[PDB]
Symmetry: D2
Subunit: 269 residues, 4 copies
Amino acid sequence: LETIDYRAADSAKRFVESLRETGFGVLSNHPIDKELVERIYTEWQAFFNSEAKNEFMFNRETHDGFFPASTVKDIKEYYHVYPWGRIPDSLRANILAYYEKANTLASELLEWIETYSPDEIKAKFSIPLPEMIANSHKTLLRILHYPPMTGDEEMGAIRAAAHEDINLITVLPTANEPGLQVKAKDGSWLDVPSDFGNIIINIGDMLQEASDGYFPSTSHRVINPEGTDKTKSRISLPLFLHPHPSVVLSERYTADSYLMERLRELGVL
Amino acid sequence: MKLETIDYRAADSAKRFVESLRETGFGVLSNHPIDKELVERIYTEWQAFFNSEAKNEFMFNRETHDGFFPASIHTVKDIKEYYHVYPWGRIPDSLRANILAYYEKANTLASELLEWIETYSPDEIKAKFSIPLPEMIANSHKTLLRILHYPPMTGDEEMGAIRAAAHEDINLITVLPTANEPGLQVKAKDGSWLDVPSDFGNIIINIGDMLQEASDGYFPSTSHRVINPEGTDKTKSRISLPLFLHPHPSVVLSERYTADSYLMERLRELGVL
Amino acid sequence: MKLETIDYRAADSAKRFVESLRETGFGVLSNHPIDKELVERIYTEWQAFFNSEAKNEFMFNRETHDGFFPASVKDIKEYYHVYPWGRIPDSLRANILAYYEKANTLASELLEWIETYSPDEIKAKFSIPLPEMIANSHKTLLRILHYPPMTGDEEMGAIRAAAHEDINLITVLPTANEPGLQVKAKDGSWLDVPSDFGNIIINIGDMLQEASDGYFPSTSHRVINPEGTDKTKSRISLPLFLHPHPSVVLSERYTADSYLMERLRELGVL
Amino acid sequence: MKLETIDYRAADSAKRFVESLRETGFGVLSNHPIDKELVERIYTEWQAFFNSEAKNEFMFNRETHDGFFPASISETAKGHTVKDIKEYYHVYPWGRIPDSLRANILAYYEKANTLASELLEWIETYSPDEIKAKFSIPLPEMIANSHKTLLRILHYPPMTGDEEMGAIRAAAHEDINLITVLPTANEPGLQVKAKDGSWLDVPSDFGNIIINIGDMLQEASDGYFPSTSHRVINPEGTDKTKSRISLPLFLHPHPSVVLSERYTADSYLMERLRELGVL
Ligand SMILES: [Cl-]
Ligand SMILES: [Cl-]
Ligand SMILES: [Cl-]
Ligand SMILES: [Cl-]
Ligand SMILES: [Cl-]
Ligand SMILES: [Cl-]
Ligand SMILES: [Cl-]
């Protein structure tokens, strides 16, 4: 999986072709203020290390807020940020500044995808791809925190199980902790280059459907390669771009009916 | 990777079956105890149900999603319609007796098969099961029998190469009778697609995400799909009767999840409000 | 307006009971078939359950809302949602499902009575016989409510349970001689519900009001803490909320399922 | 009898308005600041919306329940039909709105939130100091940019032929939310339950706006402001062949707002759902 220079004359073309083949695209030298991202990591790490985080227990109805690890206990805790949702006062400015900058970049990347789609694929998009996410109510910024392992606790081979994203596209800065991998056509796992300043973008199931399979939603995971430090906290900031529910993806589905169908496949009551 | 048809009746069928599941996520049994004629009668009478406008009297309950789901509600239309049958749920009077008799028989077999899976797990895997596998599904509220119907393609409707897209099941195990319509395929470790033998009298079992979790990845939940191979008659209806065995939500799967907290996290992962 | 205790065994009890429902939304029966000693045993063992650490292993399932709900900002009651299909502690299962069946059997009889004494013109509005609406109903709920004792410097308010109407078909509740339950009268006053040991209280809910075109009213009710209610005692109650199948046709305008959906839309639930 | 119409312009209006709410759960304002012709423009174009089959393109989203809700017809086992007497549209700033209607309806939403915010200031100002102290944050802050606040556009279609109009159009109910705000249009029938069990008529002239306390403000104010039962009857003379449009705006607090020692808005709703037996 090759890292592409956002500044390069041919970057758009190579980026979308990366998406078409692998389902993923990696960009270095991107326009999102890198010092803003590190500021964000620091202050959210403080937040997760604080007792005050429990004041923001997620709302039962809408699932915006803080989700603690916990009987049974998961190995991550997280926070769901929505522009419309509950956000702590002292973290609001930065996180929404990032949210907006990430959306704007996503919107540009969606233009690129549409530009370099063949005419027979372009013709299947009910509206232009960037419009599908403009002021999307469902777009979610997930602040993920994996805490240090304490004492006896043993770290697994796999940190995040293999999976496909359901949404349109997902945007994630890396933090130079290798482990993210994507499924290749031949059953092997390709390592996503995760140097500082890279941003990783991937196709989710709804753009796969909108494109009639042309852009594939690829299974991906995060492993713990040999010599990963069990005592370090890992924070990550994935942004899941969702289309408006009423967007017609194909002759078979709208975004809303595609989601409901998934809910029935999973047997959710 | 090959997918072998195991004769249920054979003295060593349990060990081979559980080993097939361990390697591929799937197990195929012939000469199984479920009455083949019951199943045929079920296809005939539900085919008739889907071919009547009276099916619309059974529009699914909005609260609990039991009942009839049509292909359609400018406008958009899926290539299938289906019915969600639960013992507790709405079922048409004329179809109740047979479909629930099938539900019981398929549950009783699934229950035996889970005994097999436990028996032939190594001690260090057995030891991760919070309760015996069969107890996870006994009288399960969530176990879903889906009656799936792909209607005839009409006029100049075109048939895609893929009927049901690559997916994994989330639940514990899923049990499906075949009916000599090739197409169901399972993902091999080398990125290729294996055909599942689909002769009359075969029943197909597969590992779901919750049993992968419970076994610490020892039994894999494998990607599968249904293609429309060359010669598939676009004008023929297809009915199928998949049974999705769900553990009780309070089942501890592992140090990390109950069945309930596993499903909840899936929903947060998908961005469901 | 007054609320009369009607002896279930009386020759004319059905007629009087139904007229009580029509006039007030409520009927009170004494000498009913449910064994007092079962109910006593249920109170006793569920009290112990709530007054234990064991309860926290039965935290309600997030998806289907069956199981235990702690007070856990802090409410003044905790409770358990019991369904025949749902989670139930092993040690409590047999008695509580025994009670569930007996209370359902009695509810079924009481629904026959209600239908029998409805005028023809009201009978005609019932899409199916009233008892069939609840036979093997997935949604019927047995709620076990526990108000714990006041601890230390906590004050006990005048109203234990705020004025409300039930949404369902009918609701069935044994009393254990703790006065406080009240029903709103037509003149705006509150009528005390006689709550002697051995009484069972039945009331019309909104869906049976709809199904009967207003003929049987779903009446506002509340529970107060009268003067000298002992703040240091627990209270347990066993309300059974009988819910029609979602697909039951209540009227020209609603099924049970669409009635509920309309209520969620009115409440602004996303 | 009737509730008092209070002229917004009068100097003592605020004081008398808050007292009407305390006494009856409701307040009626005339000559309010919301442009009369905006409200008329909205009635007109939404009536138009419901009078077309193009509305069906905006079928509500199943996940989030924003959009258009038809009165679907279904047929039963005995050849009866089930069909509500109203269809409606749920408008949220974040939700789906038809392009041709967005500007006016969001301008109205903004303007009505502004009035409701002033009215909540009024409610706080004239609360006694002991009641003021029960509000965890200022009342207006509870609804500022609230995600849950809902503008529900209701349409009762004409009946023709032998179709019967019932004596009751909307059943007696309470609002769960903080406050609700409703312009009227000279269609009598909205009533409020008085303390002695009788029904009070609400003066419903054009240019009136009706405001009522909801359960969450009753809870926040420890019963000082009552959430009162109201209904809509079809009084003698109501013409069944006429459409009726109405625009109630339900102001909901942020979920995380603490209402009392016992509930947040979120835990209060969850409790209602559990009491209702919603799975
Ligand atoms: Cl939308
Ligand atoms: Cl359970
Ligand atoms: Cl999924
Ligand atoms: Cl039903
Ligand atoms: Cl005046
Ligand atoms: Cl909030
Ligand atoms: Cl309610």
